[PDB]
């Protein structure tokens, strides 16, 4: 049936008749409210907008003007191949960022010994002479770094990696704290070791655990940090890091998620710098390196013998390991003292350690849901039901 | 640091039958808005206060010059020189003038520089580029938890994630569980994920930032990660805050070896987003909410327990939730006494909140077709198959 | 719409076989509206530069909002918004980013007002479920091939400017078109005019329309009777 | 059988501006460049005098549409869709006649094979007797 479009009289009668008596007043009032809101919003202004002006009496405006009229700015750049100067060809080609690259010479104020390939250099703007090398500095405040000297994770805080922790002990504790046995055995202590396994197995903290018990400082370096914005200078960064590794009495240098690097000009520069630092530093030293990855993408030039002596697989935790992790993470939360953690570890087959920590977190979540200050075994049951498993298994298996 | 944002007006929404209780409350609100307007117009009418220092400020302005370019303080050197990047992307080794607040200088904060011979002459704590300013919510959405039907478990979870740490959090550290840093809602389209985000932004006490995911990607090199960094820096600066990134799969797809420059830039932007997500401690009062339909297509690193612990499921509404949504959306309708609405719900289908809203809208349209506004049950009968477009019959019986 | 308590419908999709009036209906709507009609026909939102498609979508909706209640016509929406593909590698992602931005502008956090939008496609089934979702796209209007009466009307519009002859029965011509699209009807009118032009005349006769129907609707069939006789 | 030669002759014997293109030329590397080229070609033809667009080997881009499951097929179908929307889309073109030649018409998208877009689908069969005599004469 052809439906009729509303006519003018139809529209006019629709807006009336079946209307609330207060339609006009209410709609108008809401419109004025919105208009007044926009009025206030436009008239209230912005305010400061207070620039970084120091308190007075700290101002040397005379000297400030002197610097403005005397000192000059320098564009920074990443210096590249030295062109084999030998005091007669001191030119280097430098890449000023997204700007061009120029072959330039030095300023009289810098010796060539201070300038080398791959360091940030501040240069002038017309002659582009390298005026001052600009080392990127090292500080845990920037990026993320080792930020640890004596980790608070002990051998009692690790579980499920008994064979793995034993292998790690042979790797690090035996050459470091017992060099005499390696020396009189006439065997080079393990120069390189790799710790491969799925993420969340626990790998990092395991090393951190031994880092507390090896009486040496722990180093955390993230491969993504080397590959993200902190790329380029990162080589020099690790240079300084390796340098400070030499300064300390013993360093447990470890790189997190090396997959971001092991699998790219500046990335290759950082890699070859790592190769020089490892193959160059004397294997008899005490700064033994711990390597770990999730994807066993590593370049074939790395695991050649003499760079990675041992490989350790960190498999998923077993029943004893999973229940140990459950108890460890329950030590830090308010629960009853009669929780069957063996039950839960059974209920979490092939579950990562991070998954166990999340399970404990969700158990606390459920306890909070009922506003009970003590988490119950029921709470952990719902937590594992939620996290793990992301009729069939009960109507056929019994 | 500063404080949160997203000011909103009165809920009102206590009456809806337009019974002058609405009129009285709205007149009170309008009266207060009028006193706003009059008070500020009077204050601007008489407010003589200026000059005072003048000369020192005048000479410092002369030293600064005009115009002054803003850059990003990428790094600092001995406390007279720094490294500052212009918005183009070029950074220079410049000098720092005395009148700058050496305590304010940190890697990242915007620095006012001299146009010629670049030199740090000021610090701007409110750069907030127009894009990220847009992503910050100013007017709270009118939707609220009253408008949400069902999803009681979902509402409970989202409040336990983003509200309980904001309100009294003592339960969290009392149990010692770290607060859930970030939450991802997911489910079939039109289940209510964005609606739940709106309701959160309504009943809130923190800066709400709405993002589109695809908004983050920017044409220019490094603009993407820079914008993501700016967004999260604004989140920290106006902490506590909630960063809602709708349609996370706009960037959240599985990471693969990039070939072209653009795909490398997309990988960089997602890497920066993940780095910013890792950057702030979970004990911090900044949370993120990411919604998507294709959860299965997300990178299995973004949803790691160390990055996003929770995973809220938005399943298709049940029959009771369906009737709840029908009641909600039919609240403003003048339904007759013949309507039952039970037949539509009892029909085994895959109606969603959006589907039910559209069914109500189409029923209203059908009623308007018959020149009526009372909306019979037959209107809903027609509308259901009108909007629900598209097992071989007797195969299963 | 306010008095009824309903929410204002926002989007509409015109889907059907290739050539039925979808683009024609959009053209008519543009001609007979006071709204600022916007033609954003598909694949115009696919730029080489990264993220530019989403930016153009955002600018398009902001600019539509800035103007009066606007109409946006996304012709051949099948191009950009088709279906989000799993993962990347060889999969398309930038177009999907643009599509996701379009979805969010259509129904996201902001809830745009008076931005009624029309989309057209010949293949509705392959469109993304998040795009066909009601509230983003309501009233999925189908344009079926015209029936005999409608074909008669279409013939009469497209024969309005011809120089017909007395005794022409356009009803018979419409009957000569089992399941013919409107575009095919216009093509038949054009071919009848061509037949008249060949003989250097200005009027068209019934036989001209008959052979025009024969030529336009001609299609290759199954030559092999053995293949055609598999089914009973 | 004479398709590209008939196009060559049409280009020779015409006052129109002729835009010769080939289907494989449309498929560009960078995303969205193919549809942009299609739009540019049709815009140029529109802005010029009555013009002719000849697209040899149209089956490069105008094969029947299907559920593309990768970026390449999606981009090719985007090129085809842009061609459709330019030929008979919203903004109609004036005095812009397109000619497209193919060896396998049955694989073309039906949206391209409908009146308003391709009014006449002329078949070029192998020469039959008399036609063979004409060919032999005109080449001899």
């Amino acid at each position: 049936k052809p439906i009729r479009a509303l006519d003018e009289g139809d529209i006019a009668l629709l807006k009336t008749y079946g209307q609330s008596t207060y339609s006009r007043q209410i709609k108008q009032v809401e419109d004025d409210i919105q208009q007044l809101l926009k009025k206030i919003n436009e008239l209230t202004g912005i305010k400061e907008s207070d620039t970084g002006l120091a308190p007075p009496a700290l101002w040397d405006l005379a000297a400030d003007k002197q610097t403005l009229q005397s000192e000059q700015p320098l564009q920074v750049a990443r210096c590249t191949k030295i062109i084999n100067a030998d005091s007669e060809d001191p030119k280097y080609i430098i890449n000023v960022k997204q700007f061009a690259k120029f072959v330039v010479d030095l300023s009289d104020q810098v010796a060539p010994t201070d300038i080398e390939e791959g360091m940030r250099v501040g240069v002038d703007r017309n002659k582009y002479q390298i005026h001052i090398p600009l080392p990127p500095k090292i500080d845990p405040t920037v990026t993320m770094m080792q930020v640890e000297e004596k980790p608070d994770v002990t051998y009692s805080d690790v579980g499920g990696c008994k064979e793995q922790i034993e292998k790690l002990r042979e790797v690090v504790e035996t050459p470091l704290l017992h060099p005499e046995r390696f020396v009189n055995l006439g065997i080079e202590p393990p120069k390189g070791v790799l710790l491969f396994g799925p993420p969340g197995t626990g790998k990092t903290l395991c090393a951190r655990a031994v880092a507390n018990r090896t009486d040496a400082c722990f180093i955390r370096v993230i491969g993504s940090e080397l590959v993200q914005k902190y790329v380029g200078e990162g080589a020099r960064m690790v240079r300084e890091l390796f340098e400070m590794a030499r300064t300390k009495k013993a360093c447990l240098i470890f790189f997190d998620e090396i997959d971001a690097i092991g699998g790219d000009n500046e990335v290759q520069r950082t890699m070859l710098e790592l190769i020089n630092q490892l193959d160059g530093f004397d294997p008899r030293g005490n700064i033994k390196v711990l390597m770990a990855t999730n994807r066993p993408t590593l370049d074939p030039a790395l695991m050649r013998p003499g760079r990675l002596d041992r490989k350790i697989e960190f498999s998923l935790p077993d029943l004893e390991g999973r229940t140990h992790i459950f108890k460890i993470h329950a030590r830090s939360m308010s629960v009853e003292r009669d929780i069957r953690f063996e039950l839960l570890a059974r209920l979490c087959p092939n579950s990562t350690g991070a998954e166990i920590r999340s399970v404990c977190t969700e158990a606390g979540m459920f306890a909070i849901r009922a506003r009970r200050k003590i988490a119950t075994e029921k709470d952990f049951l719902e937590a594992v039901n939620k996290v793990i498993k992301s009729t069939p298994r009960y109507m056929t298996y019994n | 640091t500063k404080g949160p944002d997203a000011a909103s007006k009165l809920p009102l929404v206590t009456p809806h039958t337009q019974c002058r209780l609405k009129l009285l409350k709205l007149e009170r609100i309008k009266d207060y808005l009028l006193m706003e307007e009059e008070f500020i117009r009077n204050q601007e009418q008489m407010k003589p206060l200026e000059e005072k220092q003048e000369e020192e400020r005048s000479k410092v302005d002369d030293l600064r010059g005009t115009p002054m370019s803003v850059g990003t303080l990428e790094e600092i050197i001995d406390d007279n020189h720094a490294i500052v990047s212009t918005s183009v992307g070029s950074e220079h080794y410049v000098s720092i003038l005395s009148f700058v607040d050496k305590d304010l200088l940190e890697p990242g904060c915007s620095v006012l520089l001299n146009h010629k011979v670049h030199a740090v002459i000021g610090v701007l704590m409110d750069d907030t580029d127009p894009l990220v300013t847009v992503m910050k919510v100013e007017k709270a959405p009118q939707e609220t938890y009253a408008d949400i039907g069902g999803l009681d478990n979902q509402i409970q979870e989202i409040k336990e994630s983003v509200e309980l740490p904001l309100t009294h959090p003592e339960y969290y550290e009392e149990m010692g569980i770290k607060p859930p840093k970030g939450v991802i809602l997911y489910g079939p389209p039109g289940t209510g994920k964005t609606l739940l985000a709106k309701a959160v932004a309504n009943q809130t006490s923190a800066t709400f930032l709405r993002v589109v995911g695809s908004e983050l990607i920017q044409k220019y090199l490094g603009d993407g990660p820079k914008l993501v960094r700016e967004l999260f820096r604004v989140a920290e600066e106006h902490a506590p805050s909630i960063v809602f990134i709708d349609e996370i799969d706009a960037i959240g797809t599985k990471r693969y070896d990039s070939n072209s420059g653009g795909e490398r830039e997309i990988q960089r932007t997602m890497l920066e987003l993940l780095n910013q997500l890792d950057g702030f401690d979970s004990r911090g009062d900044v949370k993120v909410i990411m919604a998507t339909n294709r959860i299965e297509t997300l990178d299995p690193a973004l949803i790691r327990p160390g990055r996003i612990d929770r995973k809220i499921e938005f399943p298709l509404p049940d029959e009771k939730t369906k009737k709840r949504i029908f009641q909600i959306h039919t609240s403003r309708m003048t339904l007759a006494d013949d309507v039952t609405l039970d037949d539509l719900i009892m029909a085994k289908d895959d109606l969603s909140g959006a589907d039910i809203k559209a069914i109500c809208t189409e029923a209203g349209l059908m009623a308007l077709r018959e020149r009526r506004m009372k909306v019979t049950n037959e209107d809903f009968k027609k509308s259901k198959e009108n909007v629900l477009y598209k097992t071989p019959e007797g195969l299963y019986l | 719409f306010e008095a009824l308590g309903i929410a204002q419908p926002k989007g509409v999709l015109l889907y059907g076989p290739p050539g039925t009036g979808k683009t024609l209906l959009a053209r008519a709507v543009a001609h007979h509206t006071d709204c600022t009609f916007i033609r954003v026909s598909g694949s115009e939102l696919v730029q080489k530069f990264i993220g530019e498609g989403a930016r153009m979508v955002r600018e398009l909706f902001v600019m539509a909002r800035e103007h009066a209640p606007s109409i946006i016509f996304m012709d051949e929406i099948d191009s950009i918004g088709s279906s989000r593909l799993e993962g990347g590698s060889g999969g398309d992602s930038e177009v999907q980013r643009t599509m996701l931005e379009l979805l969010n502008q259509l129904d996201g956090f902001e809830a745009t007002k008076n931005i009624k939008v029309i989309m057209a496609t010949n293949r509705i089934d392959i469109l993304d479920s998040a795009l066909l979702r009601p509230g983003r796209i309501d009233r999925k209007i189908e344009f079926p091939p015209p029936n005999e009466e409608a074909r008669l009307d279409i013939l009469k519009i497209h024969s309005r400017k011809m120089n017909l002859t007395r005794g022409i029965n356009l009803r018979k011509i419409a009957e000569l078109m089992p399941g013919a699209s409107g575009a095919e009807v216009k093509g038949v009118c054009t071919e009848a005019g061509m037949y008249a032009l060949r003989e250097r005349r200005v009027h068209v006769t019934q036989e001209d329309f008959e052979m025009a129907v024969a030529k336009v609707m001609q299609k290759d069939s199954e030559k092999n009777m053995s293949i055609k006789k598999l089914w009973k | 059988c004479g398709k590209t030669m008939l196009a060559k002759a049409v280009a020779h014997h015409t006052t129109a501006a002729f835009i010769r293109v080939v289907g494989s030329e449309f498929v560009q590397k960078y995303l969205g460049e193919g549809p942009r080229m299609v739009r540019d070609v049709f815009r140029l033809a529109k802005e010029n005098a009555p013009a002719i667009i000849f697209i040899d080997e149209i089956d490069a881009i105008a094969t029947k549409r299907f559920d593309a499951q990768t970026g390449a097929d999606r981009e090719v179908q985007r090129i085809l869709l842009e061609l459709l929307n330019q030929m008979d889309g919203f903004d109609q073109n004036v005095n812009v006649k397109v000619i497209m030649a193919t060896n396998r018409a049955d694989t073309l998208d039906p949206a391209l094979l409908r009146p308003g877009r391709l009014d006449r689908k002329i078949e070029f069969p192998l020469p039959d007797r008399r036609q063979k005599r004409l060919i032999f004469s005109t080449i001899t």
């Binding site: - | 090199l221 070939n259 072209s260 653009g262 830039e265 | 530069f49 | 960078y30």
Partner: peptide, 16 residues
């Protein structure tokens, strides 16, 4: 194997 992927483009503005 049957990759056949397109390519995007992100320009970098440069000047001094």
């Amino acid at each position: 194997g049957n990759l056949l992927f397109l390519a995007c483009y992100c320009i970098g503005g440069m000047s001094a």
